[model samples]
Every structure is written in structure tokens, then in C-alpha cells.
Target: VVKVYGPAVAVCPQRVMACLLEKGVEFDLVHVDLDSGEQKLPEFLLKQPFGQVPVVEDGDFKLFESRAIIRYYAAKYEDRGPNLLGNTLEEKALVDQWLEIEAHNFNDLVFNIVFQVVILPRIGQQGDSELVRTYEEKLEKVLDVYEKRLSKSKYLAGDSFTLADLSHLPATRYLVNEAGLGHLVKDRKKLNAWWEDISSRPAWKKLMNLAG
Candidate 1:
């Protein structure tokens, strides 16, 4: 079994957990207390230089960065579950393209909005409305592109639920459920349907159960 070092509630860690569940790979969730600064410890730093959540240990092999970790698992367990990387060269290329878009465009904006509207307030700090509004406006434009693309295909990388679609799950959940920004997704017809489909997957449901 893999050892996933992070709190289950965190977005990045939830990303890994969802991937593992999708792949049917059993993993032990090692809770790292972010509130207590456990990730900044020397041992944790050795595992993840950036002191981030979700450093996975599979046997003697270790990996960090949630996206990289999911890619690794999706490739290594290609025969285990859904073909997350996609089947053909063209499909794989598309998956990579959309995954990059998710990372560079979608993820950052949603994370910032969640940080400002949800997390900052939880920490007893006032969230910056200007920052939240700025990120939300940028995110809306990105979703415009997504709405167009989703109109043509069932999933981001094509018809199949690939890592590209999976990568968006964690942050999207935060934006919708926690940050009270459900309208961002709910208002877009195609994007709303896309979210409804992907987020309702059994793997994501299982991960949510584990998270709670």
C-alpha cells in the first residue's frame, strides 16, 4: 500500500486520494498537522522540500506534487482502472494539454479565491474582497473557454474521464462548496453538466467519504 503524507481535508491531498481511489490503489493516509506546523519538520522537509501536503511513498519510491503523483499512478496503474492518461497518442496529448491548462489557468485562480473567501476566514483573518473578486473574474473567463470546449466533448481530454478532468476536482469542490461560489459553475450550462458528471463519479464520492 502507498503511504500518503498529508491531511485528508487539504485540496492537494484530496487530489491524490481521489486518484488512488480511482485507480483502486489502497493507500494509508498519514495525517500531517498543518496547524501545528508538522510539515515544516526536518523529516517532512526531506520528503517534500517545499513542505507541502501529499508526498506519496510507494515502496521505496517517493514523489511530491499532487499532479505529478497522479500522473505517475495513472501511468503505473494503467491496467487497473480508467485510462486517465488517455488511449492513443492524440488522446494523451490532449490530456496533457488540458492538464496544463488546469494547472496554469484554472487551479491557481480557484485556489486564490478559496484562500481568500474560505481559508483566510477560517484562520480568523479577514479575506481580501478585492483579491477574491479579481480571481473570480479571471476564473469566469477561463470557464468561458471551458464552456466552449465542454460543449464539444464530454470530458476535458475527450469522452473519457482522464487525469485532466480529475485534476480539477479538488479546487472546484472548494470553490463551489466552501467558498460559496457555486454560481460560477452552476451558471454555465455545459460546464455545469460537466461538473455534475465528473464530480458525481464513484471514486470522487469515496474520496469525499474518506475526507470526512
Candidate 2:
């Protein structure tokens, strides 16, 4: 079995964990309290030198970085559950492309929005409306591309639900729910339908239940 260490509220950890669950990979989740600075402790830093959450221990094979962890797990456990990688060369290429897009374009904008709109206020910090507006505009443009892509294919990597699609969920979930920016996704019919379909999956539902 694998051991995943991190806090549930952390998006990276949750996404990595979701990949595990979605793939039916059995694992133990060990919570690392970020509020208590557990992630920066010597023991945690030994596993992740940069002091990041969602470190994975797979029978002595320790790994960090949420995206890499999930990719490793998906390849390692390819036959366990859903085939998130892809089935063919073309499909794999597209999956890789979309995953890169999510990492580079989508995550940054959505994360900043969630941080500014939701997390900052609770932590006694103020958000710049102008900055948030800029983020929203950028996010909307990226999602518009998504809307066009999803309008044709059922998912990001094609009709099949691949890592490309799953990778976007965590940040997008926060952008919509926590940041109260549902309209960013919901207003686009194709993207909205795609989100509603994927987010309602039994695997994600179970993940949410556990995280909640």
C-alpha cells in the first residue's frame, strides 16, 4: 500500500489523493497539519526538501510533487481502475498537451483568485480587486479555449476522461466553490456541462466526502 501525507484542504494533496481513489489504488492518508507548520518540520522536510505537502511513500519509493505523483501512480496502477493516461499515441499526446496547459495557464490564475477572494480575507489579509479582475479576465480567456475544445471532445484529452481533465478539477473546484466564481465555469455551456459531468463522478464524490 501507499502512504499519502498532507492536509485535506490543500488542493495538491487532494488532487493526488483523488487520482489514487479514482484509480482504485489502496493507500493510507496521513494528515500533515499545515497550520501547525508540520510540513516544515525536519521529518517532513526529509521526505520533501522544499517543504511541500502530499508526499508519497510507495513501499520505500518516496516521491513529491502532486502532478508527478499522480502520473507515477497512474502508470504504476494502470490496470487497477480508470485508464487516465490514454489509449493511443495521439491520445497520449493530447493528454500531455492539455496537462501542460492546466499546469501553466489554468492553475496559476485560478489559485490566485481563490487565494485572494477566499483564503486571504479569512487570514486577515485584503485582496486587490484590480488584481482579482485581471485574474478573472485571464481565466475567462483560458476557459474560452476550454469551451471550444470541450464542445468537440467529451473531455480534455478526447472523449475519454484522462489525466488532463482530472488535473484541472482541484483548482477549478476551489475557483468555483471557495472563490464564489461559479459563473466563470457555469456561464460557458460546454465547459459547464463537462464540469458537471466529471465532478459528479462517483470517485470524485467519494473523494469529496472523505476530504469534507
Q: Highest TM-score among the candidates is held by which one? A: 1
How many steric clashes between backbone atoms does each model show? 0, 0
Superposed model 2: Cα runs more than 4 Å off: none
Report the alpha-carbon TM-score of model 1 versus the true structure.
Answer: 0.98
Highest lDDT, which number?
1
**lDDT tens digits, residue span 64-96, model 2:** 989899899899888888999997888789989
Clash pairs detected, candidate 1: none
TM-score of each: 0.98, 0.96
- Cα lDDT of candidate 1 equals 0.92
Worst 10 residues of 1 by lDDT: 203-212
The residue pairs found clashing in candidate 2 are: none
